[model samples]
Target: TQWKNALSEGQLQQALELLIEAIKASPKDASLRSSFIELLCIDGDFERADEQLMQSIKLFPEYLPGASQLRHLVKAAQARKDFAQGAATAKVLGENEELTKSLVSFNLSMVSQDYEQVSELALQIEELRQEKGFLANDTSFSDVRDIDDRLGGYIELFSTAGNYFLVPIASINTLEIKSATSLLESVWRPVEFDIDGLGEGEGHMPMTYVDSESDAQKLGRETDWKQIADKEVYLGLGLKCWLVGEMALPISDLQNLQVIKELALE
Candidate 1:
């Protein structure tokens, strides 16, 4: 039980080793198996995580919650960049059942930087960026910087369904980028809601989002986008766009584009 509790607290290796021993004693314990799968994914043991996920599904929810375990499987696959694996898992989780699985899958793809596959899945989602908060993809340069500056995690991008676009400038598919968005929302949603206006929480990190340029222009200042842009991950390409939620548009060709810090733009 302490081992299981360790995982809940994010103690990776200790919990994993403990869980492995526990699972060996009770191989049919489905809950332990699911836990192993999620931790393995988090630990970057994608190959074994892949194996455990498939095996656990044969008798999924034997103890743990169905939605959570299945979502973990999808997230693990996405972290591995195994889109086929992710799609198959999401299909089982809800496909013929809850259409929103596809939408979640779309968000995963977007965060993963699979720019080519995003549009099709975006259309497949029953709703965009959640039913109410969806944003259109009318991207702008500083709008990109604002969210990243606040969030400090570049693998993220989104829109405010009402107004604004958020783009990120990350040099690589780094740690924060590849982790499961499904996993993140699960973790953070609780923390976000656990407030009572009396300084009850213990951290200063605020969740970030997209807001209009007019709003951001007043708050944001110029910075060097070109610094990380020089990394190979940017690949000398520029200016891509997509719709928020799900309204399809033609994919644009990549080109050499420049971003300047001059406060002299129209």
Candidate 2:
């Protein structure tokens, strides 16, 4: 686990290069191979990850983490706007028919770019969560941690009534703004930041993630943030505060936010 910490910090390309060498050094380490796939998805290098995933299926087809990671490849592709690649990915996950349905609609929302439809489906996803009970025979596929969880946020819609609460990643990093009283709109403005690494560095206000069930509820209850018509954005847990509106977010802040978002998504 020497440099495994790097993998967790969103340094996907760097860690993947290191881990690949380590895998070469010790070819039989099954965990290393699994991790290699995770980093490739995080990097959105899905082509190579697709090849490695097929290889993983042949090697250990029934492993749950492998299946979970495969789903992540679908989400990564959706975020990158590659629908054909995403459609192929959904087919790969078709072995689980139920999940394929959910995955299909999930990609369709992205293809349509229907923020309203996505927002509705997000609530449906939340309701679906309520049907399951604790101490279950199996974990929710949605419960996957780390890189998987972070990518899951992008593909899934968790917004309602133009209010979007998200952990800042590249796909969701930019906000679209319009005036209620005017037809004007702006290009991709960035997220804000806090002083001295406070508030996840993405903003001075809190843009925290939904860490627990209670936390999610509390986040949903708040309406203190500035609102927009087409979309009202709430990005939290980067530096550890709420960020709203369009601001000039720096590159360094973005890098930190990527690492922080992966860590918090778990």
Candidate 3:
């Protein structure tokens, strides 16, 4: 204890090493195990943190705090690897009551780079709030308590005789813009974000996901053929924002805009 107390403030590793020895000496103290688990989490050892969480829960089932901590640790663990744990926890936690639990499960699905659960949760969050609720502004797979400003933006499109509004990209993060381009090339389904006022329409903004220079040439008949990019680009979240009049973002901001601010995260 004295050695831990005397260690420099930033010497977390030093203190934890002593703490681990203490746990070996007094293994029955679930609180120590819980503290160790937290250290593991801080160190980004999510795997070990999860192991400690399970051990803490088994050691002190009656300790509500331990169970709570375990639940959260497992939430992150499953988010990175074991999707089933989060999925099961969500079944027991229900869909509407606790926002963090629901958000975490949604996030777990995203790590799999699978967006079905992400979109599903966004829909439920919208319904729980009812009728064009602002919660619809929230995206999927985000559980941290900080502001997210890139939810939606606008793109201005014009022609010789007309101009049209573009609708924001109504989905949350997807791995590889290529995958998103696939969805964008087709009609959007299971929206991850709100797309109000996008009335019945034919083909949407002609978005092209390009990889090699040759792919960009396919964007138009002229075929300037720059072949400068390594992958495809998914355009339109900006254009959609412009179409709905929700944003007046400049062409530069089309790729980004900070939207939500959940400050309680600290």
Candidate 4:
């Protein structure tokens, strides 16, 4: 109970320690084991979570069903981490090979300082993405500004008023997704953004591009994902162009993008 209270109070480390002791006291408790594993996954200690998952499956083979799902989560997390390190192309096993390969190539071009080839490769990747059921390829408004080394970790959020804003990723302390009843409205999921210094705010995030009438028509244009010199992948979404200096850039393009927290399992 202390662990639950600690967790609710946002004392993650305390909750984890309490769960460690609780598990020791009741080694055979499957519920305790699963809870501890979930905490480990949240903490980004995937290796330990994987080990505990294997132990739980061995102790209670019936846990295999849930364990398998957790295993996928672990693998996906690892793949994302690898992608950040620019090593994802080798480890990404499955249907994403073509897109991953193009991304790796884009990163290589950046490293080689082949600026001339970047846009060409970016267009190629966008086409590949379209074939794989992503949004239509649109690089018309892609930012041509030199990559800002300090811009990695900022969040780009679109508001209900058709405006976009940039905020430091660290400033975002919490997020809550507002429920939607229809798929159309679900495209831009209503989200409540809780920032550190600025306090509470509300916005909508683009979940996917809305399909347009014609295949040749470029609807909801956005830049293709390109890895920066530091190995972080970023792309701009064309909800509303955010002006930086004289350049009107896709608000999504002006910042670093990465998944910080996943709420689905919670």
- In the predicted model 1, the residue pairs found to clash are 128-245, 134-161
Candidate 2 residue lDDT tens string, 59-100 = 776775645545543343433334321443322221335544
TM-score winner, 2 or 3? 2
Query: RMSD of each candidate?
Result: 16.7, 18.3, 19.3, 16.5
Cα TM-score of candidate 1: 0.33
Candidate 1 residue 59 Cα shift, in angstroms, is 4.2
Error of 1 at 208 (Å): 13
lDDT of 3 by residue, 1-266 (tens): 53246233435466568778889889999767766665444344556767776777677778767456345533433342333234322121123347435545655654564555656654554334221111222332222110111112221111112222223233112111111243112211111222334332222222221111221222211212221123221222212212223433222113322233346831
Ranking by lDDT: 4, 2, 3, 1
Evaluation by TM-score, superior candidate among 1 and 3: 1
TM-score of each: 0.33, 0.33, 0.31, 0.42
Q: Least accurate stretch of 10 residues (summed lDDT) in model 4?
A: 130-139
User: RMSD (Cα, Å) of candidate 3?
Assistant: 19.3
How close to the true structure is residue 8 of candidate 2, measured as C-alpha lDDT?
Answer: 47
Choose the strongest candidate by TM-score: 4
Residue ranges of candidate 2 with Cα displaced over 4 Å:
8-10, 68-72, 75-80, 83-266
Which 10-residue window in model 3 sums to the lowest lDDT?
Answer: 142-151
lDDT, candidates in the order shown: 0.35, 0.37, 0.36, 0.50
- List, residue by residue over 1-266, the lDDT tens digit for candidate 1: 87767655545577779989989999988777766765564454556775776677666645435534444434433432333224322121112344435434544655676644554553443222222121113222322221122122122211111111111222211112111244322211112111112112221111212221221111111111222222212211111132322442211211111222335732
Stretches > 4 Å off in candidate 4: 89-102, 105-266
| Number of clashing residue pairs, candidate 4 | 1
Clash totals, every prediction? 2, 20, 18, 1
